[PDB]
Amino acid sequence: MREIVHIQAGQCGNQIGAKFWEVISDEHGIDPTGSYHGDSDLQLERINVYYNEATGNKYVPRAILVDLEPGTMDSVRSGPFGQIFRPDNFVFGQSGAGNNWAKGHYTEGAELVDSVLDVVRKESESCDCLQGFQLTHSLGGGTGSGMGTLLISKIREEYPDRIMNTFSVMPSPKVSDTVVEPYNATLSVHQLVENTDETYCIDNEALYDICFRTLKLTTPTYGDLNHLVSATMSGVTTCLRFPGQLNADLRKLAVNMVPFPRLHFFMPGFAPLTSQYRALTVPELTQQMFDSKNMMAACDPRHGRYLTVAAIFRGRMSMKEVDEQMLNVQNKNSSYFVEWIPNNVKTAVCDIPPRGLKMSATFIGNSTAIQELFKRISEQFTAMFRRKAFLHWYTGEGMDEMEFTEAESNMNDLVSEYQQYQDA
Amino acid sequence: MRECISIHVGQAGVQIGNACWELYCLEHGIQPDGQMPSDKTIGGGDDSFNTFFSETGAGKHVPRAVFVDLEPTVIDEVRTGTYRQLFHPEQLITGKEDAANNYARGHYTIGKEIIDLVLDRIRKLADQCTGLQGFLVFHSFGGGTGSGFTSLLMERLSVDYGKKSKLEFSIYPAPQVSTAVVEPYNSILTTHTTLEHSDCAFMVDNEAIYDICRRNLDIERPTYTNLNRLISQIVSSITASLRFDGALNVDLTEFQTNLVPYPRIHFPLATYAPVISAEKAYHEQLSVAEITNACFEPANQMVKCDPRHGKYMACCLLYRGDVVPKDVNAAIATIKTKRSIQFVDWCPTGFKVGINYQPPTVVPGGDLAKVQRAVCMLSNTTAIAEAWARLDHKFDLMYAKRAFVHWYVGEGMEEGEFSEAREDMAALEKDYEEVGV
Amino acid sequence: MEVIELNKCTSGQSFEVILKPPDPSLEEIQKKLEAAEERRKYQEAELLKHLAEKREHEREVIQ
Amino acid sequence: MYTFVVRDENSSVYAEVSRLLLATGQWKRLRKDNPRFNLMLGERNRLPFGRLGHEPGLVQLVNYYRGADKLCRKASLVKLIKTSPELSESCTWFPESYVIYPGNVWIAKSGILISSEAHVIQKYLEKPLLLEPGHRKFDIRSWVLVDHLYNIYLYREGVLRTSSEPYNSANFQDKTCHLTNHCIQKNYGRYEEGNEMFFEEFNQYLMDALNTTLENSILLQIKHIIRSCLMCIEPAISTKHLHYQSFQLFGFDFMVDEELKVWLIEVNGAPACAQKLYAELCQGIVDVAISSVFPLASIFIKLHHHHHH
Numbered sequence A: 001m002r003e004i005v006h007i008q009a010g011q012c013g014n015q016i017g018a019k020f021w022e023v024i025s026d027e028h029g030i031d032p033t034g035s036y037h038g039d040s041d042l043q044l045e046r047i048n049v050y051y052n053e054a055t056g057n058k059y060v061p062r063a064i065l066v067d068l069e070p071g072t073m074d075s076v077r078s079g080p081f082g083q084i085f086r087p088d089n090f091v092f093g094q095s096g097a098g099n100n101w102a103k104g105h106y107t108e109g110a111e112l113v114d115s116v117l118d119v120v121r122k123e124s125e126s127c128d129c130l131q132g133f134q135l136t137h138s139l140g141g142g143t144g145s146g147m148g149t150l151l152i153s154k155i156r157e158e159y160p161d162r163i164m165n166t167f168s169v170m171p172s173p174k175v176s177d178t179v180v181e182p183y184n185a186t187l188s189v190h191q192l193v194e195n196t197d198e199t200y201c202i203d204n205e206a207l208y209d210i211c212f213r214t215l216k217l218t219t220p221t222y223g224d225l226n227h228l229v230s231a232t233m234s235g236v237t238t239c240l241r242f243p244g245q246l247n248a249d250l251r252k253l254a255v256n257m258v259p260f261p262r263l264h265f266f267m268p269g270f271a272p273l274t275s276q277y278r279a280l281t282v283p284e285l286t287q288q289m290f291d292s293k294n295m296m297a298a299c300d301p302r303h304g305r306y307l308t309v310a311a312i313f314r315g316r317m318s319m320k321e322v323d324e325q326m327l328n329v330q331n332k333n334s335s336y337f338v339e340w341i342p343n344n345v346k347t348a349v350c351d352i353p354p355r356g357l358k359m360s361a362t363f364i365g366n367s368t369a370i371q372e373l374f375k376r377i378s379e380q381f382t383a384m385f386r387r388k389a390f391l392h393w394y395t396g397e398g399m400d401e402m403e404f405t406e407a408e409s410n411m412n413d414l415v416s417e418y419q420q421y422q423d424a
Numbered sequence B: 001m002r003e004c005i006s007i008h009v010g011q012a013g014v015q016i017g018n019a020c021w022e023l024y025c026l027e028h029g030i031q032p033d034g035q036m037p038s039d040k041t042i043g044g045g046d047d048s049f050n051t052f053f054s055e056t057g058a059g060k061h062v063p064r065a066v067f068v069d070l071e072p073t074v075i076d077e078v079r080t081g082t083y084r085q086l087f088h089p090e091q092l093i094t095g096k097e098d099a100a101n102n103y104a105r106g107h108y109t110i111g112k113e114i115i116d117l118v119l120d121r122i123r124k125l126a127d128q129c130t131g132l133q134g135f136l137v138f139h140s141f142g143g144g145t146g147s148g149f150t151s152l153l154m155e156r157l158s159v160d161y162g163k164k165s166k167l168e169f170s171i172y173p174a175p176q177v178s179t180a181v182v183e184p185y186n187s188i189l190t191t192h193t194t195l196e197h198s199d200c201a202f203m204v205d206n207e208a209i210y211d212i213c214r215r216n217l218d219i220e221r222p223t224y225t226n227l228n229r230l231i232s233q234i235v236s237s238i239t240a241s242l243r244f245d246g247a248l249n250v251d252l253t254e255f256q257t258n259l260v261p262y263p264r265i266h267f268p269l270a271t272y273a274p275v276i277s278a279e280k281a282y283h284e285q286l287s288v289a290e291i292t293n294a295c296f297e298p299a300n301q302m303v304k305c306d307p308r309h310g311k312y313m314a315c316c317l318l319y320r321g322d323v324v325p326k327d328v329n330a331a332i333a334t335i336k337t338k339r340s341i342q343f344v345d346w347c348p349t350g351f352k353v354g355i356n357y358q359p360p361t362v363v364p365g366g367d368l369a370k371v372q373r374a375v376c377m378l379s380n381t382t383a384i385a386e387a388w389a390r391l392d393h394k395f396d397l398m399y400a401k402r403a404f405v406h407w408y409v410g411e412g413m414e415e416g417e418f419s420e421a422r423e424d425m426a427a428l429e430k431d432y433e434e435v436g437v
Numbered sequence C: 001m002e003v004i005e006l007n008k009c010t011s012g013q014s015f016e017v018i019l020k021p022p023d024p025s026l027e028e029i030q031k032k033l034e035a036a037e038e039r040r041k042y043q044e045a046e047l048l049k050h051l052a053e054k055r056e057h058e059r060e061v062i063q
Numbered sequence D: 001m002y003t004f005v006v007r008d009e010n011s012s013v014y015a016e017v018s019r020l021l022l023a024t025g026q027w028k029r030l031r032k033d034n035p036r037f038n039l040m041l042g043e044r045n046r047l048p049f050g051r052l053g054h055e056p057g058l059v060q061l062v063n064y065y066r067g068a069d070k071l072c073r074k075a076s077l078v079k080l081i082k083t084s085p086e087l088s089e090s091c092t093w094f095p096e097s098y099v100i101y102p103g104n105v106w107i108a109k110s111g112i113l114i115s116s117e118a119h120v121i122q123k124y125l126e127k128p129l130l131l132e133p134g135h136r137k138f139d140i141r142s143w144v145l146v147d148h149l150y151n152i153y154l155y156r157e158g159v160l161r162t163s164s165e166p167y168n169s170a171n172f173q174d175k176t177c178h179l180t181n182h183c184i185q186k187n188y189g190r191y192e193e194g195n196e197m198f199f200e201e202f203n204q205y206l207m208d209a210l211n212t213t214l215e216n217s218i219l220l221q222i223k224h225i226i227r228s229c230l231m232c233i234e235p236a237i238s239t240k241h242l243h244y245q246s247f248q249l250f251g252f253d254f255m256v257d258e259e260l261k262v263w264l265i266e267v268n269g270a271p272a273c274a275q276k277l278y279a280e281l282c283q284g285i286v287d288v289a290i291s292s293v294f295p296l297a298s299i300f301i302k303l304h305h306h307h308h309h
Ligand SMILES: Nc1nc2c(ncn2[C@@H]2O[C@H](COP(=O)(O)OP(=O)(O)OP(=O)(O)O)[C@@H](O)[C@H]2O)c(=O)[nH]1
Pocket: B009, B010, B011, B012, B013, B015, B016, B070, B071, B098, B099, B100, B101, B102, B106, B139, B140, B141, B142, B143, B144, B145, B146, B147, B171, B172, B173, B174, B177, B178, B179, B180, B183, B206, B224, B225, B227, B228, B231
């Protein structure tokens, strides 16, 4: 188990996805045309996880770029690292999906899905040992939401034993393109509860607040939100992309993070938050990454309890001080970690720091406080659905009101299930 | 002589194998290429070291070892490492996809597709033996391969080699050096399925070895390399009577007879002194009395527990270096009057002493200092049940909520095997208390 | 305190000191390995049955 | 900020210790089954000593000494005294006791039988010291705190648990003159409040009636017995060098005879304090046994004697 297949779907999926390849290619010393110009052998030791090797010693990302319109995928190709991607892996339709889950999942996206799966099969075939898939998308649009979850369902049919993880951007009125986002997200969440092993719940509410409150940016663009996303995505993928004596693949990580199959929605976090000169001390990283302000999903961890925690520190620091600090927050806030999973906070350290920072920490939290996120989308859903508002857009594409009722019920069951373990 | 085959299953098994065979080679004077100059009968022999090493016509000395791991990366470091020529490639077996810390994946799913191959490569070594004793099995309690595949092997080895003795060298899980959260399940599951198939098992709690490395070697954050080199010194201590001339513990059957009167209670406590740092400038060498007396301090035990609240069924003192019988007897006399050493009524209060005059060998550039004399005490005390109670309590907390259980069931395993395994452990804890109180 | 069965040699010596006197078959294994594989293949059938129903709903919506 | 747990609700003593810790701002109480504690205030039966001292980055202390039950159960206390050389069969300060499983007056105990016909069968003290005016029996309770370092701290205030009935040689069946327990009495409170005479008054009585002091006539012998009993079991129970540490409060029950000789009756593992003295003793347990191990932002006398020979 070494190779991971990456897929990016829709405007948002391709935007944050393109930043992921901008960040990690710099970390692996791969230039905009695909040639290696690093210095450490550690940059090439596990380069196979995300790159295929081409003729002339070129490194081509194992990345499939999906959208139902050309727009954003034309921007990706024109953008700074656009030339590195394999041209066959740009699979796109023309009419778009108009922020419509039904168009992505059932009509427009159905017409395109089989040609995307052919490229996935192409990449999966020439993989010595495929460990799984990762997907970037939003749940608020049409393509990433509707087609992304369709692809996830088709990939599970063809590759039932491989890991499926997602980086799933959640919608919020604060950063809102259309009023139907709660509908699109609720329909997607039900798909993710069934068909993913992990979903990283990037909340655009939280990314905005981090940009506004704790980074003093008055008018945040999507680039400012995506900067925080790409830093986190680098962090969660670090332990696969480098050593250091950590013998773990996606399954091993998923086995230790997910005690219950449906409860695999994580709370990502990063320290320090950037947009510096004084490098942070190990106590500061530990306090910041556990701080609510640094959470990428707009939930208060004090309102829930941690099932599992994973923290991966980057940079040259004392592992003794890391162990001391990670044991300090557990033993001084022991009510917020479930007693019925002993030793649930685990830690790794990687020597290579990311670009610009001398040391950093990435936080992955399977907290029951994530119910707050699903409750917030459930309220926005019901507000519209009690009056069947905007439903004509979905019923015109052949959907039934029953499918909405089901999805509503399934997400409120997920919230009930998170509540069960919060009190136990 | 009678041959002994060592089996190393999983990461912890393989890497501890590495450390032991490195040390065995230095002790017997065998070199990385496999030549043993001091050996004069070229092509074969029935010496004591030949129990652990076979010979070829070219003069190579080849470990009777089988390395098994469900993924390649750890055994690949053996294939390209310092002792690469030492092993035949057929001894080093690897799968593609690991057990993901999942007992059920290692035992049932991935176990099934590799078990017949591994037994075949074991049979290739057993056919080179003029009179096989049996097996030394090295593994972790916490790994999926370590727990799951080991138990399937141990089941099959009882079928294919019913007359032969089986010893375990087991790594008991410690949260301070493990990233695996499901280890309590894996530990209880494998202990249940392996119990009837293992004749004598030496547990080593990673917690104890870790703090010994902190307290006595002045190592800030002990790596597996720090822990393994110290563990292999204990292992060597234990296996030295099989590899050298002597009259105590000369075969695998004698470990069972000396240390295990009650077959289910087959977990002797190792204690080891002295552990001294090579970086230490000034060291006053310890006497026979001081290192024998150190065998009853809990800080030197392989598993932290309290022998004073429990009872002994057997005790063995294995000395390495400048030691003579009368200095040992004087030390045992002083120690008996000071400390609380209570035996069970049916067993004699006594000590089986073994002395080898060669002092402990240390790996060059290692963490341990050279010492004039050392000792490993193997005692079967009911105090080691403390380790089961801890592991079982952790199990009960997780299992009450069915936490992580879906991963095991998803790989074909039945939920009933969890409580079935836990009941054997509930019976085991009860066996220890009947004997010890 | 009696020192019994003392045996000596050039590389060492050993003695005892007494302070005071007083499996399933190849059929059953290969059977229950396969029984878990039946549960593994039954669970994967129920998944591909469930996903087949999703595929027929996908056709029903577009029609 | 240190953390603790409470697993003995009946414990009146450690109910107050729990209260005093909380009222500092530097000790949080956790749930009964939380593993991540600094201090355990543990149960009486089946206290899981095997789970202590195995949590990384936590110094763990407990309020019981594992193996101290060999001093506190009556059957084992008798067996300890006969078998241990440093106490011996010819022990001057322990009454002649025997073990048979389920002046020639004896007493049986573990329902108390005092007769010559008829668990442990102990020699009954026929001529005890009788307080006046009253002509009545008593027993002395002293509280001993052994810390993690095995410093034996005797608390300066004890108490005489008195009988209110005149002592009778011929009449054995009447329990209220022979047995001097607090519950059995409740003439309850005629001479002193709740059948409790404190050390100040008892010193004064001895001065006035016998021309001696409590320190000389009785307390010297008490300090010898406490020290003799605890140093005997130190190798069996000491938590020096051990991965968890123990302290414990003990209750030593004594009997003074007519010629001013002190006799050990029972050691008590989970003893209750007298009503007046809770506040001081429970603050002392915190200062000496808990705050020494876990420092924040004398009422005892230390028992030590190194005579060279
Ligand atoms: N002493 C020691 N313990 C180890 C070593 N490697 C792993 N462990 C411990 O073993 C447990 C994890 O099991 P592993 O042996 O890594 O797992 P595995 O047998 O390879 O099984 P899978 O990873 O599931 O295929 C943890 O308790 C680790 O601390 C080692 O080299 N030495």
